[PDB]
């Protein structure tokens, strides 16, 4: 791995700061780019940095020190649309393809003002026999653990009700196993003691 990036991933509150670091183990690669890639799209250059010092592009600031081959990207006032995979890419002096680092996955999360964690059961609209469990309205730093070969649990997902200025987290769980129920769906997760479990 010629181009080494850290950290592997990073969570950033909306409005917050983030620092990504990059190095090359090869002094020949001294011309660096930062690229961003959203899910289902191609990479898009944010900025290049070819000389020692700081460069600014909007809320983004790149820094290079060639002597030590340290490169970084600093994000200010993080927006939800900044959630993306961030690549450090470099090229040698002397046209070549870019060499990319493994990337840093950045997630910008909402601050949940009035958390109301709950697990609900929803029934299938065509058949009342089948259902899923919706863990929702928990705090953004709650971690939802994957889990039994026949129990399925999605990662937490942030939806944005734009006109209401309202965002909320959720995860979904389902299974055909006889002992599965919403009461125990998310047991392998650490969830608030006050989680609302209705029926």
């Amino acid at each position: 791995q010629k181009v080494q990036q850290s950290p592997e991933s990073l969570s950033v509150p909306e409005g917050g700061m983030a620092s990504l670091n990059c190095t090359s183990s090869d002094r020949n690669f001294q011309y660096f780019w930062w690229y961003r890639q959203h899910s289902g799209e191609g990479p898009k250059a944010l900025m290049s940095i070819f000389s020692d010092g700081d460069k600014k592009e909007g809320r983004f600031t790149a820094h290079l020190n060639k002597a030590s081959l340290h490169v970084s990207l600093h994000i200010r006032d993080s927006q939800p649309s900044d959630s993306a995979l961030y690549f450090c890419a470099a090229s040698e002096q002397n046209a070549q393809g870019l060499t990319f680092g493994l990337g840093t996955r950045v997630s910008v999360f909402p601050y949940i003002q009035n958390p109301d964690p709950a697990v609900y059961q929803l029934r299938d609209s065509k058949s009342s026999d089948k259902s899923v469990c919706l863990f929702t309205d928990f705090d953004s730093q709650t971690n939802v653990s994957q889990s039994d070969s026949d129990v399925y649990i999605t990662d937490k997902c942030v939806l944005d009700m734009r006109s209401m200025d309202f965002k909320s987290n959720s995860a979904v769980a389902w299974s055909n196993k006889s002992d599965f129920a919403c009461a125990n769906a998310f047991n392998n997760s650490i969830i608030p003691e006050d989680t609302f479990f209705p029926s």
Partner: protein, 242 residues
């Protein structure tokens, strides 16, 4: 100023040829192919300028063909397709060459399979909002499950009163394997659409979860009893209720 690529998805079996098409920025002179493995590591394959392949990486198999005929797309052709060729291939172009910003296309997702007989479209179920959620929050979350599909080439969208909506929606970034053990596992994918409770309660409101599945074409032969798993849409619907 955007590079285009078609097709967005390609399923093919081993030992075939596939053609990846790229439409670079109009005045660019340098064209690139890259491939991305497992949604992260990005690797240079080959570039093209002055009407000829120039640089190649160790990952570029010379058996591949790279062309850009006058007035036609920049192409990469993979032959014979192998399982290890599965990846998202991205084209890029630049004006001034090496040190210039490289503009990347949206990518082509290539899945090479041992055979096409396992291709299977999703079953889609829509789960209606919980009365307790409505009582507790004055909000109503609909959940959609797409299950049992293979390979994992799908896009999910939500439609309210015949109009596509994005506000209030979040769909898993990636499908999950139903049987992690298997290399041939089918996939599931979930999404939510959250609306104010009074909107879900209105019986004049129509909600539809829709899964666009990429599958076989008419050019693919099908001899098995179950329906030919062609490219198709599978949806689930419901009307609001008090």
């Amino acid at each position: 100023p955007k590079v285009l690529q078609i097709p967005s998805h390609q399923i093919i079996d081993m030992g075939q040829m596939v053609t990846l098409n790229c439409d670079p920025v109009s005045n660019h002179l340098y064209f690139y192919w890259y491939k991305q493995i497992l949604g992260q590591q990005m690797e240079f394959l080959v570039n093209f300028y002055n009407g000829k392949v120039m640089e190649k990486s160790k990952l570029f198999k010379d058996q591949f063909s790279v062309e850009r005929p006058d007035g036609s797309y920049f192409t990469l052709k993979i032959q014979p397709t192998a399982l290890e060729d599965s990846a998202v291939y991205f084209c890029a172009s630049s004006f001034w060459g090496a040190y210039a910003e490289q503009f990347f296309g949206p990518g082509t997702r290539l899945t090479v399979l041992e055979d096409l007989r396992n291709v299977t479209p999703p079953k889609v179920s829509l789960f209606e909002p919980s009365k307790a959620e409505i009582s507790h929050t004055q909000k109503a979350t609909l959940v959609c499950l797409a299950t049992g599909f293979y390979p994992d080439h799908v896009e999910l969208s939500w439609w309210v009163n015949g109009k596509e909506v994005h506000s209030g929606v979040c769909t898993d970034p990636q499908p999950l394997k139903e049987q992690p053990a298997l290399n041939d596992s089918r996939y599931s994918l979930s999404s939510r659409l959250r609306v104010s409770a009074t909107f879900w309660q209105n019986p004049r409101n129509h909600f539809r979860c829709q899964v666009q599945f990429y599958g076989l074409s008419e050019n693919d032969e099908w001899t098995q009893d179950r329906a030919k798993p062609v490219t198709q849409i599978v949806s689930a619907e419901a009307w609001g209720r008090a």
